[PDB]
Amino acid sequence: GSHMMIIVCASCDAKNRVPEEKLTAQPSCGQCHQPLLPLEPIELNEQNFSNYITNSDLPILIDLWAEWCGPCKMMAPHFAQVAKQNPRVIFAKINTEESPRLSQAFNVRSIPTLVLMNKTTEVARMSGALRAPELQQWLDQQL
Ligand SMILES: [Zn+2]
Ligand SMILES: [Zn+2]
């Protein structure tokens, strides 16, 4: 076998079977041709979340945020920078106002809250803004 890894497309929901050795090449979805591994934060919402989290093989670090949240805006560039540094981790964002049932299901209090998921299980979480080096260190400690 080709060490197939299930990479979900957040845009059309397709469960792409991607050879492990091809992940570094950042391929596009076989159905809709959107990027599968942009090394940028992807948008999850109530209409793509369950399919994405349930079927993904790679860990997913989720930033629960809102547009009016100052600490979220402080964190956003650091979250995007760390996303570029971890090609085998999906970085995702959930807007708590757009997706209130997801925010409630994650038991969010203050934002930003980051939740690390792996194969449907919550591995770890943290809250509050962090700079990129500290965020990378936290991620490495959990994985
Ligand atoms: Zn392998
Ligand atoms: Zn697609």
Author numbering: -3 to 139
What's in the article?
Trx is a small cytoplasmic enzyme that can reduce di­sulfide bonds in various cellular proteins. Trx has a common CxxC motif (C: cysteine; x: small hydro­phobic residue) in the active site, and this motif is critical to its reductase activity.
Finally, the 1.20 Å high-resolution crystal structure of abTrx2 was solved with the MR phasing method. Interestingly, although abTrx2 was purified and crystallized in an oxidized state, the CxxC redox center of abTrx2 is in a reduced form, characterized by the absence of a di­sulfide-bond between the two cysteine residues at the CxxC motif. Pairwise structural alignments of abTrx2 with the three structural homologues show that only abTrx2 has an α1 helix at the zinc-finger domain [Figs. According to the DTNB reduction assay, abTrxR showed strong TrxR activity in the presence of purified abTrx1 or abTrx2. However, the abTrx2 C28V variant completely lost its TrxR activity, while TrxR in the R13E variant decreased by almost half [Fig. 4(e)].
